C-alpha cells in the first residue's frame, strides 16, 4: 500500500553475523589496476636455494 519507503533509520547497524561467510564466486577475478606497484620492503632478502 503506502508503507514507509525510507530507512528506519534505527535499524540494525551491526553485522548479521550469520551473513555469507564464504567467498563469492562472482567476485572480481581481474587484477586491480591501481594496486601496490612499489617493491615490498618486507620481502624475501635471502637467496632462493632453488635458483638456477
Amino acid at each position, epitope marked *: 500500500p503506502n508503507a514507509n519507503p525510507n530507512a528506519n533509520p534505527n535499524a540494525n547497524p551491526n553485522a548479521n553475523p550469520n551473513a555469507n561467510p564464504n567467498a563469492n564466486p562472482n567476485a572480481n577475478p581481474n587484477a586491480n589496476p591501481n594496486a601496490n606497484p612499489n617493491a615490498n620492503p618486507n620481502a624475501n632478502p*635471502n*637467496a632462493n636455494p632453488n635458483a638456477n
Partner: antibody, heavy 123, light 107 residues
C-alpha cells in the same frame, strides 16, 4: 652455531663519521640479508637499515636516510655501516642481525642478533 | 609509521605464575609480529615469529596469540631463566619495536 661480532664503535664528535663492521661466521653469510638495529635508553629498539643478500636493495629508517650507508663484502663475510654527520641522538648500541630463512611470499625479520657495539656521540 | 605499544610496562611476577603480556599496533599488521627476549647486558633473542609460531629451540612454555592489531604473549609456567625484557616487533611495514615489558621478580 651462528655468530656475529661487531666492531668499530667508540667516541666520536658530532658531525664526524664512523664506520662499523660486523663479522659473520657459522653460516653462509652471502645467502642472507642483514639488518642493523640500534638500542638507546631514550628510544628503545629502533631499526636502522636493511640490505639484501646481494646488495641490490637497501632500505633505511627515516631518521637516518641520507646519512648512513649500509654495505657488505661477501668475499670477506663482512657487513659495513658508514655513518656520516652523526648527531647527539645517534648514541646507542648497534647490533647487526641476520634475517631468518622463510617462505618465498612471507614477510621477513631477524632471528639472530650480534653482540652489539656501543657508539657515543658527544663533544 | 606504525606505532607499537606494550602493556604493562612492568610486571611483577613469581616463579610458576601464568604470565600474559599484550602488544598493540596503531594499524592492522595482519599476523607479521615477532617477539624477542632480551636479558640485561646481552643481545636480544628471537622467541616467536608470525605471532604464533614458536622458534626452534624455544621451550614449549612460550606461546603467542593474536591477529590484526592486538597480540599477546603467554608463559604458562614461569621459570627463573624467563626473567627478562620482552619486545614485540611488527614487520608488516618496515620494522618498529614496542617499548618493552620487563618481567620483575615479585617478593
Amino acid at each position: 652455531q651462528v655468530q656475529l661480532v661487531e666492531s668499530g664503535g667508540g667516541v666520536v664528535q658530532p658531525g664526524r663519521s664512523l664506520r662499523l663492521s660486523c663479522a659473520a661466521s657459522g653460516f653462509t653469510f652471502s645467502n642472507f640479508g642483514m639488518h642493523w638495529i640500534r638500542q638507546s635508553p631514550g628510544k628503545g629498539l629502533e631499526w636502522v637499515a636493511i640490505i639484501w643478500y646481494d646488495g641490490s636493495n637497501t632500505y633505511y629508517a627515516d631518521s637516518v636516510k641520507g646519512r648512513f650507508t649500509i654495505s657488505r663484502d661477501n668475499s670477506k663475510n663482512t657487513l659495513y655501516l658508514q655513518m656520516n654527520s652523526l648527531r647527539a641522538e645517534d648514541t646507542a648500541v648497534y647490533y647487526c642481525a641476520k634475517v631468518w630463512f622463510g617462505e618465498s611470499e612471507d614477510n621477513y625479520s631477524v632471528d639472530v642478533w650480534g653482540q652489539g657495539t656501543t657508539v657515543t656521540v658527544s663533544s | 609509521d606504525i606505532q607499537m605499544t606494550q602493556s604493562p610496562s612492568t610486571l611483577s611476577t613469581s616463579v610458576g605464575d601464568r604470565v600474559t603480556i599484550t602488544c598493540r599496533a596503531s594499524q592492522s599488521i595482519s599476523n607479521w609480529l615477532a617477539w624477542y627476549q632480551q636479558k640485561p647486558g646481552k643481545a636480544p633473542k628471537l622467541l616467536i615469529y608470525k605471532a604464533s609460531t614458536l622458534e626452534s629451540g624455544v621451550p614449549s612454555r612460550f606461546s603467542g596469540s593474536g591477529s590484526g592489531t592486538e597480540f599477546t604473549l603467554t608463559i604458562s609456567s614461569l621459570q627463573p631463566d624467563d626473567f627478562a625484557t620482552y619486545y614485540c616487533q611488527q614487520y608488516s611495514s618496515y620494522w618498529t619495536f614496542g617499548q618493552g615489558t620487563k618481567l620483575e621478580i615479585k617478593r
